[PDB]
Amino acid sequence: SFAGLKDADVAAALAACSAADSFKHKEFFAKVGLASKSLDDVKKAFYVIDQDKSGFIEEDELKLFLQNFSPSARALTDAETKAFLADGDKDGDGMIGVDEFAAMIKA
Numbered sequence: 001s002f003a004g005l006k007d008a009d010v011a012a013a014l015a016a017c018s019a020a021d022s023f024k025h026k027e028f029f030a031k032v033g034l035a036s037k038s039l040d041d042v043k044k045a046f047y048v049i050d051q052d053k054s055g056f057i058e059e060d061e062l063k064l065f066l067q068n069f070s071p072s073a074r075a076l077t078d079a080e081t082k083a084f085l086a087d088g089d090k091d092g093d094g095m096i097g098v099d100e101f102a103a104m105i106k107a
């Protein structure tokens with residue numbers, strides 16, 4: 001709801017990644033409906049996920065990614081989380097900032 005996503009698109013993408021190590025960020029984004037929202041909307045999203053309002057998604061917030069979308073969802077695994085940063089952390093700081101986030105949702 002925070003980023004204008006359908007209960008339904010969210011239910012379907014969580015299903016697709018219900019198994020540990022099955023999460024693929026690119027796919028999730030597209031299936032949740034994220035990849036077709038406006039940049040404003042991509043920005044609201046970044047802001048909820050960054051729970052502490054640090055202006056960065058820290059690897060502990062990343063671990064809880066899916067929980068943002070649905071409270072009963074599973075935590076991401078270490079290899080899931082590693083792969084996320086690996087492709088989104090472009091400056092090498094170990095965090096995903098707003099610009100790095102939008103960049104990964106884009107394509």
Ligand SMILES: [Ca+2]
Nearest residue numbers: 050052054056
């Ligand atoms: Ca944060």
Ligand SMILES: [Ca+2]
Nearest residue numbers: 089093095096
């Ligand atoms: Ca970074």
Ligand SMILES: [N+]
Nearest residue numbers: 052058060061
């Ligand atoms: N954090």
